[PDB]
Design an enzyme around this catalytic site. Structure first.
Site, PDB file in Angstrom:
ATOM      1  N   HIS A 210       6.179  -0.875   1.118  1.00  0.00           N
ATOM      2  CA  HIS A 210       6.082   0.133   0.032  1.00  0.00           C
ATOM      3  C   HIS A 210       7.094  -0.146  -1.087  1.00  0.00           C
ATOM      4  O   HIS A 210       8.148  -0.694  -0.802  1.00  0.00           O
ATOM      5  CB  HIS A 210       6.252   1.581   0.556  1.00  0.00           C
ATOM      6  CG  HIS A 210       5.496   1.862   1.829  1.00  0.00           C
ATOM      7  ND1 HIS A 210       4.139   1.652   1.980  1.00  0.00           N
ATOM      8  CD2 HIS A 210       5.963   2.184   3.059  1.00  0.00           C
ATOM      9  CE1 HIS A 210       3.809   1.887   3.239  1.00  0.00           C
ATOM     10  NE2 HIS A 210       4.887   2.244   3.908  1.00  0.00           N
TER      11      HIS A 210
ATOM     12  N   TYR B 260       0.888  -1.159   0.000  1.00  0.00           N
ATOM     13  CA  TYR B 260       0.000   0.000   0.000  1.00  0.00           C
ATOM     14  C   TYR B 260       0.942   1.229   0.000  1.00  0.00           C
ATOM     15  O   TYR B 260       2.147   1.101   0.119  1.00  0.00           O
ATOM     16  CB  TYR B 260      -0.993  -0.026   1.197  1.00  0.00           C
ATOM     17  CG  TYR B 260      -0.382  -0.079   2.579  1.00  0.00           C
ATOM     18  CD1 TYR B 260      -0.020   1.063   3.264  1.00  0.00           C
ATOM     19  CD2 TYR B 260      -0.099  -1.330   3.190  1.00  0.00           C
ATOM     20  CE1 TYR B 260       0.564   1.011   4.517  1.00  0.00           C
ATOM     21  CE2 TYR B 260       0.408  -1.377   4.449  1.00  0.00           C
ATOM     22  CZ  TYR B 260       0.729  -0.269   5.125  1.00  0.00           C
ATOM     23  OH  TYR B 260       1.310  -0.352   6.360  1.00  0.00           O
TER      24      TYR B 260
HETATM   25  C1  LIG Z   1       8.392  -2.963   8.580  1.00  0.00           C
HETATM   26  C2  LIG Z   1       6.957  -3.495   8.331  1.00  0.00           C
HETATM   27  O1  LIG Z   1       6.666  -4.387   7.524  1.00  0.00           O
HETATM   28  N1  LIG Z   1       6.034  -2.919   9.090  1.00  0.00           N
HETATM   29  C3  LIG Z   1       4.611  -3.281   9.016  1.00  0.00           C
HETATM   30  C4  LIG Z   1       4.269  -4.328  10.098  1.00  0.00           C
HETATM   31  O2  LIG Z   1       4.798  -3.719  11.336  1.00  0.00           O
HETATM   32  C5  LIG Z   1       4.953  -4.492  12.499  1.00  0.00           C
HETATM   33  C6  LIG Z   1       4.140  -5.618  12.673  1.00  0.00           C
HETATM   34  C7  LIG Z   1       4.295  -6.348  13.874  1.00  0.00           C
HETATM   35  C8  LIG Z   1       5.187  -5.861  14.804  1.00  0.00           C
HETATM   36  C9  LIG Z   1       6.028  -4.775  14.680  1.00  0.00           C
HETATM   37  C10 LIG Z   1       5.845  -4.038  13.488  1.00  0.00           C
HETATM   38  N2  LIG Z   1       6.615  -2.950  13.298  1.00  0.00           N
HETATM   39  O3  LIG Z   1       6.931  -2.084  14.308  1.00  0.00           O
HETATM   40  O4  LIG Z   1       7.405  -2.813  12.122  1.00  0.00           O
HETATM   41  O5  LIG Z   1       2.859  -4.605  10.052  1.00  0.00           O
HETATM   42  C11 LIG Z   1       2.093  -3.441  10.437  1.00  0.00           C
HETATM   43  C12 LIG Z   1       0.601  -3.926  10.370  1.00  0.00           C
HETATM   44  O6  LIG Z   1       0.418  -4.841  11.488  1.00  0.00           O
HETATM   45  C13 LIG Z   1       2.347  -2.333   9.415  1.00  0.00           C
HETATM   46  O7  LIG Z   1       1.798  -2.671   8.136  1.00  0.00           O
HETATM   47  C14 LIG Z   1       3.864  -2.013   9.350  1.00  0.00           C
HETATM   48  O8  LIG Z   1       4.103  -1.150   8.209  1.00  0.00           O
HETATM   49  C15 LIG Z   1       4.120   0.254   8.552  1.00  0.00           C
HETATM   50  O9  LIG Z   1       2.791   0.637   8.578  1.00  0.00           O
HETATM   51  C16 LIG Z   1       2.682   2.097   8.834  1.00  0.00           C
HETATM   52  C17 LIG Z   1       1.192   2.450   8.983  1.00  0.00           C
HETATM   53  O10 LIG Z   1       0.728   1.771  10.218  1.00  0.00           O
HETATM   54  C18 LIG Z   1       3.297   2.824   7.648  1.00  0.00           C
HETATM   55  O11 LIG Z   1       2.618   2.372   6.477  1.00  0.00           O
HETATM   56  C19 LIG Z   1       4.777   2.482   7.576  1.00  0.00           C
HETATM   57  O12 LIG Z   1       5.323   3.105   6.410  1.00  0.00           O
HETATM   58  C20 LIG Z   1       4.884   0.951   7.391  1.00  0.00           C
HETATM   59  O13 LIG Z   1       6.237   0.485   7.503  1.00  0.00           O
END
Ligand SMILES: CC(=O)N[C@H]1[C@@H](Oc2ccccc2[N+](=O)O)O[C@H](CO)[C@H](O)[C@@H]1O[C@@H]1O[C@H](CO)[C@H](O)[C@H](O)[C@H]1O
Ligand code: C5P
EC number: 2.4.3.4
Length: 273
Positions: free
Chosen positions: A249, A210
């Site tokens: 991304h 996304y």
């Molecule tokens: C790095 C990654 O894939 N992040 C995802 C992931 O994050 C996590 C999940 C479980 C535990 C720790 C994390 N984390 O701290 O990295 O999955 C979550 C959904 O459960 C999100 O999709 C993370 O991605 C982030 O999402 C935020 C919006 O919430 C934003 O898009 C960031 O750019 C993105 O990395």
């Protein structure tokens, strides 16, 4: 109405690549009027973060608009101005020693994101913020003038706006998140989930899981502004990707979208240092 700036982002027949992607009918902010999602859009949005048994969305939005304003103009009253000039400030360390602060602050709107600070970085990044995009996992306290644009990636993110301005019951999502925020309820805006899917489908052509917050901020400003200037996007001149103060991304494909927009003068990019 045609804008009074040098160029107008809305202008059709400058570039057919832009006209194919830009859809003037899109509403970038959630309101009580526009909050019904199509099934396909809702199913797509739930798949982003795959929360287990989310609460019903229309119930959540009802409760949300008991708290924050439910009848904002979706283009933030662009109808009342003839040329709105915006700066969208990303987080790249290319802003270090760029001295872009005054030119950034000279815009009508300045849009920032995530935990990026201005304090102690003003000469480079400016001191003005009119709008700042956040999600619960990437919030910092905002100055009181600043409109907070919550970018929701899951039902809990809307629930979090409700809780963090009221009862303070949500303290964890996939990571810890603030149980309270100080932002005044009247200063909160909600990025429309359908406009996130529009960004993904039409601007990113389905690249990434996304869109990143940076490209969501850019396309949002294409709709709300007539002239858009980008600062703090991309690597620095040495090729490093770091923040100025300190996969999910497709950052290459998103970067290329901003490069093409610059090439057709729909934005300007300030590359910094
Ligand atoms: C790095 C990654 O894939 N992040 C995802 C992931 O994050 C996590 C999940 C479980 C535990 C720790 C994390 N984390 O701290 O990295 O999955 C979550 C959904 O459960 C999100 O999709 C993370 O991605 C982030 O999402 C935020 C919006 O919430 C934003 O898009 C960031 O750019 C993105 O990395
Ligand atoms: N080095 C960097 C750092 C951030 N950015 C932009 O600033 C936006 C927000 O950055 P953060 O998610 O790291 O706070 C990103 O989603 C990205 O589009 C960039 O384009 N180059």
């Amino acid at each position: 109405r045609p804008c009074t700036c040098t160029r107008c982002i809305e202008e059709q027949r400058v570039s057919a690549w832009f006209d194919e992607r830009f859809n003037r009918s899109m509403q970038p902010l959630l309101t009580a009027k526009n909050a019904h999602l199509e099934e396909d859009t809702y199913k797509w949005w739930l798949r982003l973060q795959r929360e287990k048994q989310p609460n019903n969305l229309n119930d959540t939005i009802r409760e949300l608009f008991q708290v924050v304003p439910g009848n904002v103009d979706p283009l933030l009253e662009k109808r009342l101005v003839s040329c709105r000039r915006c700066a969208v400030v990303g987080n790249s360390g290319n802003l270090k020693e760029s001295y872009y602060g005054p030119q950034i602050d000279s815009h009508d709107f300045v849009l920032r994101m995530n935990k990026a600070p201005t304090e102690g970085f003003e000469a480079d990044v400016g001191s003005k913020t009119t709008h700042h995009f956040v999600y619960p996992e990437s919030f910092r306290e905002l100055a009181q003038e600043v409109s907070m644009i919550l970018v929701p990636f899951k039902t809990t993110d809307l629930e979090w706006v409700i809780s963090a301005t009221t009862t303070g019951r949500i303290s964890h999502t996939y990571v810890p998140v603030p149980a309270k925020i100080k932002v005044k309820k009247e200063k909160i805006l909600i990025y429309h989930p359908a406009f996130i899917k529009y960004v993904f489908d039409r601007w990113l052509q389905g690249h990434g899981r996304y869109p990143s917050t940076g490209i969501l901020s850019v396309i949002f400003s294409l709709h709300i502004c007539d002239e858009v200037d980008l600062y703090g996007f991309g690597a620095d001149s040495k090729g490093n990707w770091h923040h100025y103060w300190e996969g999910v991304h497709d950052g290459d494909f998103e970067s290329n979208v901003t490069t093409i927009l610059a090439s057709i003068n729909k934005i300007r990019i300030f590359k910094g240092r």
